[PDB]
Amino acid sequence: FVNQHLCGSHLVEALYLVCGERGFCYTPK
Amino acid sequence: GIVEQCCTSICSLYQLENYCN
């Protein structure tokens, strides 16, 4: 799932699956 | 930033993992 264009909710979902219980930051600009 | 790295170009594990806490 990570090796593609990932935008909007698809990006946030990739971040969630990769980071697991670490969490993350999603910072668009 | 991430949009540039992963939306408007092809993403990678390496780059996504940078945004994990």
Side-chain angles (χ1 to χ4, degrees), chain A residues 1-28, chain B:
Chain A
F1 62 94
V2 301
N3 295 296
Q4 67 181 306
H5 302 265
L6 292 171
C7 306
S9 62
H10 299 199
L11 186 52
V12 147
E13 157 178 311
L15 288 158
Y16 168 72
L17 288 170
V18 157
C19 306
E21 50 194 47
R22 292 183 272 179
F24 57 87
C25 286
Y26 165 55
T27 320
Chain B
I2 188 162
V3 172
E4 257 192 298
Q5 298 156 13
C6 279
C7 175
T8 51
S9 56
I10 291 166
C11 194
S12 74
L13 183 50
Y14 187 99
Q15 289 169 124
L16 271 165
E17 228 177 21
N18 283 324
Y19 299 98
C20 300
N21 294 320

